Amino acid sequence: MDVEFKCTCSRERCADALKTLPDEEVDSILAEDGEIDMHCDYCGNHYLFNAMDIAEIRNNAS
**12 vs 30, which CB is nearer to Zn ion?**
12
At position 50, the amino acid (one-letter code) is N
Spatial CB neighbours of 5, under 8 Å, sequence gap ≥ 6: 45
Using alpha carbons, select from 54, 30, 51 the residue that is nearest to residue 11. Answer: 54
At position 20, the amino acid (one-letter code) is T
**Site string (3-42) toward Zn ion, x via CB under 5 A:** ----x-x---x--------------------------x-x
Is 43 an interacting residue with respect to Zn ion (CB under 5 A)?
Answer: yes
Site residues (vs Zn ion, CB under 5 A): 7, 9, 13, 40, 42-43
